[PDB]
Amino acid sequence: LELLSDQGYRVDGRRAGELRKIQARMGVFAQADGSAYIEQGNTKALAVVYGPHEIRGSRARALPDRALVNCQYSSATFSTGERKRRPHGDRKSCEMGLQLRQTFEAAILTQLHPRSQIDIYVQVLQADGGTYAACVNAATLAVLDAGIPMRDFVCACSAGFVDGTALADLSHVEEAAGGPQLALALLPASGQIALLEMDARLHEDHLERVLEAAAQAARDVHTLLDRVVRQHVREASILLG
Amino acid sequence: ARAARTVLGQVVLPGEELLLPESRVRVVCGPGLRRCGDRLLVTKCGRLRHKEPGSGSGGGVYWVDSQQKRYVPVKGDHVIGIVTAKSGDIFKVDVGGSEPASLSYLSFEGATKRNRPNVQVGDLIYGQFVVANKDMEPEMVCIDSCGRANGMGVIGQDGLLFKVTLGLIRKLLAPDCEIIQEVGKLHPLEIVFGMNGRIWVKAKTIQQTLILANILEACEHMTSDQRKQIFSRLAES
Amino acid sequence: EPLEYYRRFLKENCRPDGRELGEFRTTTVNIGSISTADGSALVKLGNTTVICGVKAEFAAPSTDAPDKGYVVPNVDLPPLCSSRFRSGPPGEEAQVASQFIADVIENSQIIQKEDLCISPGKLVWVLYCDLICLDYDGNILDACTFALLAALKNVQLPEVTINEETALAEVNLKKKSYLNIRTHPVATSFAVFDDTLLIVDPTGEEEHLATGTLTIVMDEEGKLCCLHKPGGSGLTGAKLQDCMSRAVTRHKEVKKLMDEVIKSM
Amino acid sequence: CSLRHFACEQNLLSRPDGSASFLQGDTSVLAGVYGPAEVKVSKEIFNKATLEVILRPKIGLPGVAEKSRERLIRNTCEAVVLGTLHPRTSITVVLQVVSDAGSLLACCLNAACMALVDAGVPMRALFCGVACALDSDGTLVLDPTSKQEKEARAVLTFALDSVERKLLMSSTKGLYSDTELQQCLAAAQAASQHVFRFYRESLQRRYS
Amino acid sequence: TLSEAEKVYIVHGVQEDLRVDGRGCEDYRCVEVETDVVSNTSGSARVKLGHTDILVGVKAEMGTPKLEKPNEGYLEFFVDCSASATPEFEGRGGDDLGTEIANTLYRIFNNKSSVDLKTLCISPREHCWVLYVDVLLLECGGNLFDAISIAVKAALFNTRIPRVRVLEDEEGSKDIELSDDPYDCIRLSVENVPCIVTLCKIGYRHVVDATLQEEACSLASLLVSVTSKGVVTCMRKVGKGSLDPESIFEMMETGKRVGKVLHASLQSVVHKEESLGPKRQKVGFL
Amino acid sequence: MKETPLSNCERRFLLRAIEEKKRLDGRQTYDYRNIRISFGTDYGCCIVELGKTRVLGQVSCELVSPKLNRATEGILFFNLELSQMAAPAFEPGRQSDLLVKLNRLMERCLRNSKCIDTESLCVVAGEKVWQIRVDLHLLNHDGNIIDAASIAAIVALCHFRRPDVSVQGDEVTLYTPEERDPVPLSIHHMPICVSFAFFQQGTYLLVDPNEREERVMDGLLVIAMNKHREICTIQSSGGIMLLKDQVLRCSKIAGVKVAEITELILKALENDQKVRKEGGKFGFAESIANQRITAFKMEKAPIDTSDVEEKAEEIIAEAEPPSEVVSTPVLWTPGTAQIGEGVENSWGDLEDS
Amino acid sequence: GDHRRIRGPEESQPPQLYAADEEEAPGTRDPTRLRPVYARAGLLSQAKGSAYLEAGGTKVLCAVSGPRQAAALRGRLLCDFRRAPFAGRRRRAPPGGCEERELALALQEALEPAVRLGRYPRAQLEVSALLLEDGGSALAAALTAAALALADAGVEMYDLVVGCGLSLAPGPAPTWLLDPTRLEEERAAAGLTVALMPVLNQVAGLLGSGEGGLTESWAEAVRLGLEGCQRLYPVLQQSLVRAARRRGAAA
Amino acid sequence: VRYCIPGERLCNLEEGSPGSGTYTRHGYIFSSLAGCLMKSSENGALPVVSVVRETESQLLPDVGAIVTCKVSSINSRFAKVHILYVGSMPLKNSFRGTIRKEDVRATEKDKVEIYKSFRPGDIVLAKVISLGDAQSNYLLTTAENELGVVVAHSESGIQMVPISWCEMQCPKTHTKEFRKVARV
């Protein structure tokens, strides 16, 4: 099957260094302390956060120096072509909630809420392509909506490598083809990387170009989400006064 | 069923019995021995030892000495511990036993309700016990019998704290031990031993502190003479 | 108080149950009451009531030897028989009480799995015998064994015939056969006091204060199947030879009981 | 009848308090013990300690069988350890099966005994492990192998004291009569006299 | 929880036909039902009765008939309880509520005339259609039973069930052949799908569509399952207090009338949404 | 119970060291702690010791039916495990956020690299195929569990030897090491993990850290890369915030280290095969150091089995025979019978009515 | 499969699905009759309170444990329903089932309106019920027995709980029946079980589902259920009297 | 004599008054237990009717009640116990308690070292004062002359004897130890 034509067009019609269309939203729910909604291409995510509160259970599991970040991951049973129902014991959810907890224990400026918990929930309504970056961006928007201070605006994007060229924002068809996939979590102002992942084989000479293309695609996600945040804050500033 | 005063300096095993001298005597059995009837029973491996200073009186205790790591608090021992909490008006400290010890804010030298001492969480303290029976958490005071702290309190600012087995601590704390004098001949040093299996060292160079830390854990073994002098020369460098 | 009080009855040679330190409780059984099971039996041992039930199904023979029908025992201890058992997954006591019965079933060779196959390599019978304790007073492994053996003497299976062109199974529910039983293993339990005293048929309080326990199960030809000694004080060959002399009479008693209740139909 | 090659090593691992690997022929078992330490409040007992024994196989996961053989090992160590000297604390025994060649329970008991001795736990008397396997005719074989275990019609295992050679633990497989139970018990009593000599020689060498 | 004085004020108000919102003893707050929200599924709904939020999905898949009857399909429910609804719903903890709702839905739909079963069988003893109804709790704001029993009738009305004409003949291509048309489907005749009616009891008066505060002041409640025709399917009493025989008879009439109005108005609203088709766009979550 | 806490003097001393570019145990920055492998007697069993860590690897295969789809391959389980004896903290169900990241690292490396040839493990399709099952255990924790676990899994998989079968027409047959010789496996490449630790916000790094150095570090970087020059997984984790030159430097370092480790592994496997083929003695027993105080060996011993007959005979003869009070069973009504002291009345009736 | 039990065959199809004997015909009866019932209280010796209820083909055993440690100002009422595997046409999985949890909740939401928990602060009561045989209406037996056990365990209650059961005939002129059996329950279209307090005259629990859709049949089903719960009371009246007469005289 | 069921008509509000373990409604007296019908005539007519089983297997503690206990462990500021007897009768299960360092003596004084007051393994008589928090559940007290340790136990398993208000002595080895002796 052709994943890159001779003309340079992909299966869905975009070039190598081209992203899908994103359409976000802030303030979806009312009861919670924060909310967000993003649809990156054909993947629909959702995130809900709860502000610093009293530790549930009160089983002396607190930290006297910082706060306790608690991230979960879930997925709807109609999120793909087949039903594929799973119980709440899978290790895919555990590893996704652990990479989420790892990146948000580094992005959030947590040394201001001693002996407090932060509960972050992510719900995926339709998965087609990169799920990690869609969850990270939806929870970055939900955290901004909740007013929790943070060092920067963390954004994530993936990449690939086919026929000696570097792709960007891979889809499920391209992902399920046995290629060197790769994902980041970038802080645009400093250029630092919060998380790095990889699978499948790849030569050592092509790591610089796949990593550079992924970082550039994350910097391209940054501008599009930045205009959404600026329009939202100008909206509320106009409403307030 | 052998008799005592005959198997001194001999390796014994649990379950064996031995006969103390005939006329029941009030000699108290030590750590690895328990007195039953007019015989003694062995509950720990090791080597029988008897210590009576200088006279024909009592003057004498029976105690085997073995090699182990887990420490059980004994009343009147100088034990180094690490602070863990600051709850209430006490200082819970981890010594290495089953339960943590307990200081008091006024146990230090010249401490009152106002001029309390600065003790953080995660600091090492030199101090001795005053109650160590198996009925309560052990409790230690930290200055003196009279009240002048003789080097006790919080120690350690630019050294390295490592852990050794109880055998090396027992071997070093002997009146006929030449380990420290010869080891300090090469590298000048100052040590603060602890009967819970901990040692604090401070050499001049960090390299020397690493070397002393590694080469002191091996001095319980590697018997002196044919081995120790050549070993010292090789490490001289 | 605890130790000294009981030894007053021991020296008196009459324990608080009213027993001569070498006699068993009253034993009674019933068979054929639960009509939704292939076979069942209720065992009463002066408290310590245990009930067992057998269900027969079809299953595929194993890949190694396709001529054997499985038999699976299970012992369950609900939180209603006693007050120390808590709800949830099965505990240590029930797991040991099930492994012991599985070992007895295997070692005793009471049944042969070659008598359960229907068509070799295609279908074999499977027997599901489940034991539920209704009251825990003591001596569990004796009544569990007696309940299982009593139940296995009543289970009856229907004649199944497999066609050739249809190749399905047609069950003849009118002509019902019986089961072939080879031996009759009966167990006996002893409780050892501090270092020398041995009693028979103990109680939960006595097991709470005892320092060991021994169990011996015998065939109908004076052959030992298992010698369960979890550990404790320690015994000698003379004491074991004293125990087996009592176990011979106990086994004769129980085998006469089973030989008589079944005869009454 | 002849016990096969024996070997043992002590103080292998640096993290636990006492370690002891005991391999008898081809089969081997590794063990370690943590000394008296803190215990959960919901499981502690006054005037006594609490013994915890867990066994890990090499292939698969533990089931009903491994806990049924864990009770025997815990109730055997409970009869020779003076727990009253250490109340409100915990003693734990962990056993790992490295290789299996036959008579595994006896090698596990010897591994546990050597780990408790190395760890410096107050003990009342030592204990041993001897396994007997009489063949289809009655020829006794001591310390058998799984080749002989497969053919044998009965396999027996005993744990023996180190004072008067009494019987502590007994788990039996197969059916037999009492006469050869007595003769295999006597063979076990004769066999433990060499294992205890191996114990004494090993500890005498350790303190050289 | 709320204090005793607040509970006294609320119970006194209900007896006077006044409530904190301002409605009466029988008023019913409006809802914002919608359809065709999810892509991957074969039918969707989104019911918003207030602070609550529901989202369901129905997917029809190939399967095998059960043993008791060969000319039939079956229905599969799975009431998930997402942890975003409440922090106390983290991981384990939403299992008992989800099982309670799934069992209630099974009792509701466990009848021969629920929708149909002949239509979902194509070849006797060999094949059948299976339906997976997947409820997803998004928020909880009281009256959770009815906000789901409405989104189920709504989503069931929007099914597709793509038609298959494959011949079963052995000589022919027995393997299932579809119609190859991406837009060829069939409706489901959901006219008489039942719905749940809740009746909380406060004082000696019964109230429909009680809020969380009004639910905390009640001791019992009754559930009635009524179709558009006005027939009862399931009847379960839930609560922690007695109810008395009379209140059963005087609650049954209110269940009948509210059910009839609910069904007629739901038929009207779905027909209004359907009268204009691909126009009007679709808006949801954005 | 928990693990001993960390003081405030050791942290200062370790960081003064790291600043000064000198480590505790003497080894410089780009070094490993030397390695020592030991082989069992039956195939696919090894004990690796990196520094003072121990891992036990054991491979084992079995013949099953191959699911539905993928009718011409075999499956490959894995199961890492952490033994309660490895360290005080490990608890059977209370360390569930290290097991996951470890199993994942191991599985992504070993199963996504496609080095094992699961193509040629079929007998029929739709029918019985071999299901291998790797198994690792941690015995002693001293830091860097994953390098040791990876080397262990590699050696255990490169030392296994399957059973072997004859297939012709439509008929099966299963041999045994005396009927037919066990057969090796096919291993494309050798994926070997490497770890890096970062200290005081990426300013320094140290290769192959041990357990104290693991508690004074910010975050960890792992780079799994098979021989030649081909990377197979990377996973940044911990608390780190990285640059772009550093990933490349790390990749170079991992290249070098995996080269050296594969050298060592190949040499050790070769030596082991030479020993097994000469005809000498092998196994866990003939590995115990004899130059050491803590080892002792004892050849066989007939003990004296000359007396057991007499003792058993006298014991059986010298004890009281079974007594002769025989009990009677009572019959109430078909179905229920009682034995024992009995009950006075036949059965109760209208006792209270 | 399960690492805490003995593993047998992976799959096992019971012979009922291969049973070549066709389903028989139940028959007919008078719908104004009740199966004779025998009740015994205080059965178990190690339990604080117990009762055994048997009527026709139903055998259920219930035991009550005393108050233990751990809406406070009030005590909880834990419940647990479990039936023996050797009960009914087929076997059942030991680990559990959704039907058992449904009946446990139908028990908890029916026995709390009777006991007064405002007398056991920070305490809790545990009730365990076991069904030895399923030969008819089951939830009409797990309520009567679990209410007899509580009254015999010396806990303070406002009143007892008496349950009943009904089923609907499948003919062209359906009529509700009282105390149905498995031959009259597997051929039915709907079922109803009521829980009536006989003295306070207050319904405690209600449950019913099926094919009966006219709101004039359920009025009769409810009120004949109430007449049944008013007709089962005297037997339970003499059972606790005999239980206390025997228990007291043993001192 | 007649027994009861936990509901029946017994008396009017004019023909008597409710007692222990009973409730009333609509002008009638209704039973709430299965015990025995007891009518305490007392003095002044109008007997206070009540029902009592008189076979107490378990009984919940109250705000004020005398209980026999058994020390489990001791701390510098509290001492966890296990409630064993409710006054006289044996208890089927065991609850928990806590004696803070204010309830030892009848003065709520300073000093009062807990270590030598309630050594573990003893049996004491104490009174509850509250229903406690979730950390300490019953909050027992011994602030009375009649409360304190009653039956102690020696170091080596010998029945102990009171010797003074604060000191007890061993009969075998004549060893002196400290307790809090309650009056017999």
Curated annotation (Swiss-Prot), chain D:
Please cite one Gene Ontology biological process associated with this protein.
Answer: rRNA processing
**UniProt subcellular location:** Nucleus, Nucleolus; Cytoplasm; Nucleus
According to UniProt, the tissues expressing it are described as: Highly expressed in a variety of hematopoietic and epithelial tumor cell lines, but not in normal hematopoietic tissues or other normal tissue, with the exception of testis.
Q: Major location, coarse class?
A: nucleus
- Looking at the record's lineage, which domain of life comes first? Eukaryota
Question: Consequence of mutating M123T?
Answer: In CABAC; uncertain significance; no detectable effect on interaction with EXOSC3, EXOSC9 and EXOSC10, when assayed in a heterologous system
Q: Name one GO molecular function term.
A: RNA binding
Q: Does the keyword Acyltransferase apply?
A: no
InterPro entries on file: ExoRNase_PH_dom1 (IPR001247), ExoRNase_PH_dom2 (IPR015847), ExoRNase_PH_dom2_sf (IPR036345), PNPase/RNase_PH_dom_sf (IPR027408), Ribosomal_Su5_D2-typ_SF (IPR020568), RNase_PH (IPR050080)
Give the family per the record. Belongs to the RNase PH family.
Q: Which PANTHER family match?
A: EXOSOME COMPLEX COMPONENT, EXOSOME COMPLEX COMPONENT RRP46
What is the name of the protein in this document?
Exosome complex component RRP46
| Species name | Homo sapiens (Human)
Curated annotation (Swiss-Prot), chain E:
Cited Pfam families? RNase_PH, RNase_PH_C
The secretion signal range is none
Highest taxon in the source lineage = Eukaryota
Compartments it resides in = Nucleus, Nucleolus; Cytoplasm; Nucleus
Which positions does the record annotate as the modified residue Phosphoserine?
A: S173
Would you tell me the Gene Ontology cellular component terms? cytoplasmic exosome (RNase complex); cytosol; exosome (RNase complex); nuclear exosome (RNase complex); nucleolar exosome (RNase complex); nucleolus; nucleoplasm; nucleus
What Gene Ontology terms describe what this protein does at the molecular function level?
A: 3'-5'-RNA exonuclease activity; mRNA 3'-UTR AU-rich region binding; RNA binding
Which biological processes are named by the entry's GO terms? Answer: exonucleolytic trimming to generate mature 3'-end of 5.8S rRNA from tricistronic rRNA transcript (SSU-rRNA, 5.8S rRNA, LSU-rRNA); nuclear mRNA surveillance; nuclear polyadenylation-dependent rRNA catabolic process; RNA catabolic process; RNA processing; rRNA catabolic process; rRNA processing; TRAMP-dependent tRNA surveillance pathway
Identify the keywords attached in UniProt to this record, alphabetized: Acetylation, Cytoplasm, Exosome, Nucleus, Phosphoprotein, RNA-binding, rRNA processing
Residues with N6-acetyllysine modification: K112
The text of the family note is: Belongs to the RNase PH family.
- Recorded protein name is Exosome complex component RRP42
**Lineage, broadest ranks:** Eukaryota, Metazoa, Chordata, Craniata, Vertebrata
Which gene specifies this protein's sequence?
Answer: EXOSC7
Swiss-Prot record, chain F:
- Sites of the modification Phosphoserine? S65, S306, S346
Cellular localization per UniProt: Cytoplasm; Nucleus; Nucleus, Nucleolus; Nucleus, Nucleoplasm
Q: Which Gene Ontology molecular-function terms are recorded?
A: 3'-5'-RNA exonuclease activity; mRNA 3'-UTR AU-rich region binding; RNA binding; RNA polymerase II-specific DNA-binding transcription factor binding
Crosslinked residue numbers (Glycyl lysine isopeptide (Lys-Gly) (interchain with G-Cter in SUMO2)): K297
> For the cross-link Glycyl lysine isopeptide (Lys-Gly) (interchain with G-Cter in SUMO1), what are the residue positions?
K297
UniProt-listed GO biological process terms: exonucleolytic trimming to generate mature 3'-end of 5.8S rRNA from tricistronic rRNA transcript (SSU-rRNA, 5.8S rRNA, LSU-rRNA); immune response; mRNA catabolic process; nuclear mRNA surveillance; nuclear polyadenylation-dependent rRNA catabolic process; nuclear-transcribed mRNA catabolic process; positive regulation of cell growth; positive regulation of transcription by RNA polymerase II
**Looking at the record, which segments are called Disordered?**
335-353
Which keywords does this chain's UniProt record carry?
Acetylation, Cytoplasm, Disease variant, Exosome, Isopeptide bond, Neurodegeneration, Nucleus, Phosphoprotein, RNA-binding, rRNA processing, Ubl conjugation
Q: Where is this protein primarily located?
A: cytoplasm
- Positions of modified residues (N6-acetyllysine): K297
Taxonomically, which superkingdom? Answer: Eukaryota
Query: Where is it found, in Gene Ontology cellular component terms?
Result: cytoplasm; cytoplasmic exosome (RNase complex); cytosol; exosome (RNase complex); extracellular exosome; nuclear chromosome; nuclear exosome (RNase complex); nucleolar exosome (RNase complex)
Region span, ARE binding:
1-268
- Family from the record: Belongs to the RNase PH family.
Q: What is this protein called?
A: Exosome complex component RRP45
Q: What is the lineage of its organism?
A: Eukaryota, Metazoa, Chordata, Craniata, Vertebrata
From Swiss-Prot, chain H:
InterPro entries reported in the protein's UniProt record: Csl4 (IPR039771), EXOSC1_C (IPR019495), Exosome_cplx_N_dom (IPR025721), NA-bd_OB-fold (IPR012340), S1_domain (IPR003029)
Q: This protein is called what?
A: Exosome complex component CSL4
Q: Which PANTHER family does its entry note? A: 3'-5' EXORIBONUCLEASE CSL4-RELATED, EXOSOME COMPLEX COMPONENT CSL4
| Subunit organization | Component of the RNA exosome core complex (Exo-9), composed of EXOSC1, EXOSC2, EXOSC3, EXOSC4, EXOSC5, EXOSC6, EXOSC7, EXOSC8 and EXOSC9; within the complex interacts with EXOSC6. The catalytically inactive RNA exosome core complex (Exo-9) associates with the catalytic subunit EXOSC10/RRP6. Exo-9 may associate with DIS3 to form the nucleolar exosome complex, or DIS3L to form the cytoplasmic exosome complex. Exo-9 is formed by a hexameric base ring consisting of the heterodimers EXOSC4-EXOSC9, EXOSC5-EXOSC8 and EXOSC6-EXOSC7, and a cap ring consisting of EXOSC1, EXOSC2 and EXOSC3.
Q: Which organism is it from?
A: Homo sapiens
Could you tell me where this protein is found in the cell? Nucleus, Nucleolus; Nucleus; Cytoplasm
* Gene that this sequence comes from: EXOSC1
Sequence similarity: Belongs to the CSL4 family.
Q: Name one GO molecular function term.
A: RNA binding
